[PDB]
Amino acid sequence: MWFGEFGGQYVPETLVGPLKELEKAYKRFKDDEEFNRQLNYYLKTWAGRPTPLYYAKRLTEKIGGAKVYLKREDLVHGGAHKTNNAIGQALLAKLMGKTRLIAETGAGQHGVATAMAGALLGMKVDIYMGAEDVERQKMNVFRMKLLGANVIPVNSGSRTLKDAINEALRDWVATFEYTHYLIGSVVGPHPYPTIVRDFQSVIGREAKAQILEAEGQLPDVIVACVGGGSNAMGIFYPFVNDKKVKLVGVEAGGKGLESGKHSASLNAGQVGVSEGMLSYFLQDEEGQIKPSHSIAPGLDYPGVGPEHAYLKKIQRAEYVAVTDEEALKAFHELSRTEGIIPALESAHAVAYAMKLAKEMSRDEIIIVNLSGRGDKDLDIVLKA
Amino acid sequence: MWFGEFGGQYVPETLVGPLKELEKAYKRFKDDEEFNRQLNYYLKTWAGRPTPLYYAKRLTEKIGGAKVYLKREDLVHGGAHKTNNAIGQALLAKLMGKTRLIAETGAGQHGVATAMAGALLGMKVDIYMGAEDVERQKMNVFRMKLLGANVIPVSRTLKDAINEALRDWVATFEYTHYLIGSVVGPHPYPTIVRDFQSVIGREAKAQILEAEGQLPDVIVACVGGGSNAMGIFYPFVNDKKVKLVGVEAGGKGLESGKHSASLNAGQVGVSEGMLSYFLQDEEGQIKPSHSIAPGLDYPGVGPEHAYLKKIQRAEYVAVTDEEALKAFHELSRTEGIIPALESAHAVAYAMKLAKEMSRDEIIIVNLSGRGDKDLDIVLKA
Ligand code: NA
Ligand code: NA
């Protein structure tokens, strides 16, 4: 339940039971030969795992320092790492005997991932989306409708991801008998942060095998973008006990850390309770959760996963920020140099890895998690 | 050069030299250790090959008939099989000492695939695109711009761009490679493109043997020019028991005069440097084609598919625009795969054939692309 001083189950007594059952179900199926066979089969034949580890020779040679490798989560079915978790929790829910999936979404990528997995396994999908996010993401809303999922708009509060998350929890209390709440990051009450991380750990496990095969050694640095922290925990977790491997999470620096217009929870936030967890949250002087900003909608969350809060306190992972402008330059650079259009979320990771590569030895190795493809982001890259 | 009676290099003397020098280079590299090592490395680490072979169990049991496997070219980098051919020709170009790639596109897809492959290999990419095609497909124009390609605006259709690109190549062939996005045109393009897409059928073979212990009874692929169909078909061509079915665009209807089916209702002729079936009027001028799927909207068809209809090795059917849209929606709701409207044609015909077959039998449908590109078109309907 706890990652050092961070995490927990900060929920009403109505949710304690549901989460008890979820936890008992996960303990059972986590190691069940049939669950893991099914999960592995769907990840291989349906998602297209294992994703490749691509050596960006031209980017590497242009910067003239560290070998830059890209973990290509952009190539997974749906175009984002979110599919790995979406499949895992939908299979669990199915085996738990649930018939309906509910999910929060802000970017819409978790909504699409939940809708695909719900369509794959023949479950009803209800996507609680902030009313502001629905109008922001008209195309992703259409994809979800084509996949057979209903977008239920959340009109409460900031009408964003925070509000969508709590509306969904209020439904789950009523519906938990026949419904699994499918959380799309390493956030929320226990056991969600552990489950989401366990289902994203496949990224790191592949990437470790692939970098040992390609270079015959572990990476010097692993760089991943952090919204809630699922793709980052995914690639980090298997290297956590490899002490020489440096872990760097890149949060949304937005319009600048000094601007107040960002999502860098771990850089600028204060320890607090929201969405049923004890973690770093952007807070005003009064102590209320402040609004977040990122050009990358997937990094636009005021909070961060508790396990990242733990990794920051023990100083196992360093957390940095990249601005909207640095991310945009990286979006263009990776496109022109490697013919790969990265998600704006992922372009944060690429932006920091490029600055870090320049300062580093030619023999040294950076793995960047390329969390998604940028097809969904072309309109906003156009506007800028 | 020849696929029985069909094929050839039916081009002006100015293009004969370039095509002969390309032909000599392909011979050199097609079996070279280093070329194939470099190509396989890019297809593996950049493109994400091999793509999976997916059993659509919910679709299969819903039909009640044969097992429906989907070959998932939707999951290759760029979201279409076209990447396999783009990498192949682009790397060949680089090893030939070419510094520039040029291509033509209307739909935009082949433009993007060339831009991606060009960027990967650090070669200049000039895409010729008709001003009328540009305005319709503004997002693919940005995509190419992002990928560092120079989109050169040109009835402002595909034709006027092809002629502009053939005038470019005649001059620039010394440092430039013309990248062709289907098994069409003069020799050696129809052979080269099929060879670079054949990887689909070799993967699909090993994968279906691992899965079901036996080769498929039928293989179903959509057919515009016929690269994705040739890619999955070709390795299985010698396996006599394996039936091959290409699906063309039945459009508004095969009798409606708004289709793109060349192998059904087309007459043998010489256009675009090749001897193959084309959609022709009474006068025998090439008629315009219509398909809701932009990739299937080609007046003609590749010569090797003409050869396969002639020796009756491959049956060639059309599916209506309406049937393909029902297939697009069905596969999305049933298997949570949003297919390309191109691919949906193959899926639409696969759903008919399955019901009229035994539950023990196997259909492999080539899912040629993902339907992210075709969302604005499906919204219209
Ligand atoms: Na954050
Ligand atoms: Na045709």
Author numbering:
A (entry chain A): 1 to 384
B (entry chain D): 1 to 154, 158 to 384
Quote what the paper states about this structure.
The second enzyme we screen is a previously-engineered β-subunit of tryptophan synthase from the thermophilic archaeon Pyrococcus furiosus (PfTrpB2B9, or 2B9), which catalyzes the bimolecular condensation of Ser and indole. It has been demonstrated that 2B9 possesses a broad substrate scope, and is capable of producing diverse Trp analogs. This hypothesis was further motivated by the location of H275, which is a ‘second-sphere’ residue situated near the entrance to the enzyme’s active site. We also observed mutations that resulted in a general increase in activity across all substrates screened, with H275E displaying the largest boost.
To determine how products fit within the active site, we solved the structure of H275E with two ligands bound, Trp and 4-Cl-Trp, at 2.39 and 2.25-Å resolution, respectively. Instead, there is a 3.0-Å halogen bond to G298.
